[PDB]
Write a protein that binds this ligand. Structure first.
Ligand SMILES: Nc1nc2c(ncn2[C@@H]2O[C@H](COP(=O)(O)OP(=O)(O)OP(=O)(O)O)[C@@H](O)[C@H]2O)c(=O)[nH]1
Ligand SMILES: [Mg+2]
Length: 175
């Protein structure tokens, strides 16, 4: 029997949340993924864990209507950033801090930041994305940052393994 955990996939519109989930669940890269106009629900299993992926649209309208509930009901949060869109790093930092770092509804749950689109020539490194999001100023929450690509699959297995390990560690430490 597997334990069900709900994971909220958040991040700005165009960050690559839906494309990463498609690469993991279908094994294929879609370079023409369409904007999510609400919620996509998908599943993937990794060992004793059934991951229920809540892929929420990142457009402003969906942050204000849907993000609060799915973030508050999740067991883990994945915040995806387009590393090749530095014109939106300040906006991505603002939303990460409002909806995750300083959101009182987020307890001591796993927080994984994915610095996505590493395959693109203008992609900033994981270190550069961490500094742009002020991750080095996060004082009370644990977090991980992983550079990845839905196009090549780079680090997607390792990122999912990190989440499975953190969720399993919480279960084992409590027992
Ligand atoms: N080259 C490249 N393109 C990517 C990658 N991830 C996503 N894309 C592309 O980036 C665009 C936006 O990806 P989406 O998956 O729709 O982004 P999203 O975060 O789900 O956006 P919303 O649905 O608006 O929340 C699409 O054209 C994707 O094909 C990646 O790692 N590399
Ligand atoms: Mg989407």
């Amino acid at each position: 029997m597997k334990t069900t955990v709900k994971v909220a996939w958040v991040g700005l519109d165009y960050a690559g949340k839906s494309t990463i989930i498609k690469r993991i669940t279908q094994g294929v890269f879609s370079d023409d993924t369409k904007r999510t106009l609400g919620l996509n629900v998908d599943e993937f299993t990794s060992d004793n864990i059934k991951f229920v992926c809540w892929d929420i649209g990142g457009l402003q309208v969906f942050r204000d209507s849907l993000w609060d509930a799915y973030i508050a009901g999740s067991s883990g949060i994945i915040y995806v950033v387009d590393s090749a869109a530095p014109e939106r790093f300040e906006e991505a930092r603002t939303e990460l801090w409002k909806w995750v770092i300083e959101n009182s509804k987020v307890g001591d749950i796993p927080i994984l930041i994915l610095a996505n689109k590493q395959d693109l020539p203008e992609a900033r490194s994981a270190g550069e994305v961490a500094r742009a999001l002020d991750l080095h100023k996060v004082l009370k929450h644990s977090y991980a940052i992983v550079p990845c690509s839905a196009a090549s699959g780079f680090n997607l297995e390792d990122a999912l393994e990190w989440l499975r390990q953190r969720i399993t560690e919480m279960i084992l430490e409590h027992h």
